Symmetry: C2
Subunit: 211 residues, 2 copies
Amino acid sequence: MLKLCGFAASNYYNKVKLALLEKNVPFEEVLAWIGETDTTATPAGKVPYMITESGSLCESEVINEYLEAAYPQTPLLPRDPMQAGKVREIVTFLELYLELTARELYPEAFFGGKVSDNVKERQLKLLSRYVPAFAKLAKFSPYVAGDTFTLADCAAAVHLPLVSSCTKIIYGKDLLADLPVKEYLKTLSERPSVQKVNADRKANTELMLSR
Amino acid sequence: MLKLCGFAASNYYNKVKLALLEKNVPFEEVLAWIGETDTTATPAGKVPYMITESGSLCESEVINEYLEAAYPQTPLLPRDPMQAGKVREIVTFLELYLELTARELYPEAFFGGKVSDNVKERQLKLLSRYVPAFAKLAKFSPYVAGDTFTLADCAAAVHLPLVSSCTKIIYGKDLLADLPVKEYLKTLSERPSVQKVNADRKANTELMLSRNK
């Protein structure tokens, strides 16, 4: 049985969890806090990581690509190369330009730290460019990349709420406000995978901050 | 035939170019400078981007995945999912943790700007953790992910030299010094693809820097 390692307070962990659940791949969840990870499976100590009989993988999108390839029964990518491209493009744009941009701010927004005004100013200029660019790509019809649920949704379902929260705190504005995110999440809310992931997330987040 | 858009001074452009060359896929290069891109194709103005009859794609790894699916004749990924995964893991680690980390220094290293001491310190602490982590994934036997040329080499071939140059300029030491990068580039040096890419890279860098923009 494949082991998904990390913690449900992690959005990238939840991205993989969503894929696993949607595809009906059996898996075991392993609680591995930062600093308590398997450095042979995850050499830079990042979560999530996956351990199987055949090996380990330590980057969430790499994992999800592996799942697509290893478990073809319920595909989460379109068959057509271009269409699959458009899904991947939405994921990448999302993670590289929205999530990672916002992530520079998380120490302050979420973990009681401080980030400089210079950093804040930098990230805002990026987000101001990147959000409208992402809106150009996203479909929300009703799913992020179109009329079906894909790997892009696995990513959007977990990243969008965090980018929103983060920006509201730092900038006093939800920089995703002009996107149909509330309606998107409502669409997702109905899904059992999403319900489990969100319930687990809240539980782990409480646990993590109790510590 | 597909258009590869951007400019050859770009490492991410060249990553795609190498894949195209290696796979014998025909393409046309379209010059598109930063600030002058086709934003219907590339909404955040990033290069490289690809335009085909069927549509457009604007991220390099997204493009290279597309080429593998659309042009399967000369594969740059193994068939085994786990093996294909190790290759992707190398690309991802390298880009997210080595390239993007060093990229924060490029303004000063390459473009005559200044980055703050705080930024230099930050990035150095990151690279000092991430380089040895990368070294654990990398095989260099003789290729980056193993004994065959893969998509990971298209990435490593372009990103590793830039990370070394950057760090030497900024820190007065090659932070990749403990990896066999010299030997790796020599391995790659013989490849016609790499030779064309490097030639064009240099020509375009000079042109780029000549511009009043």
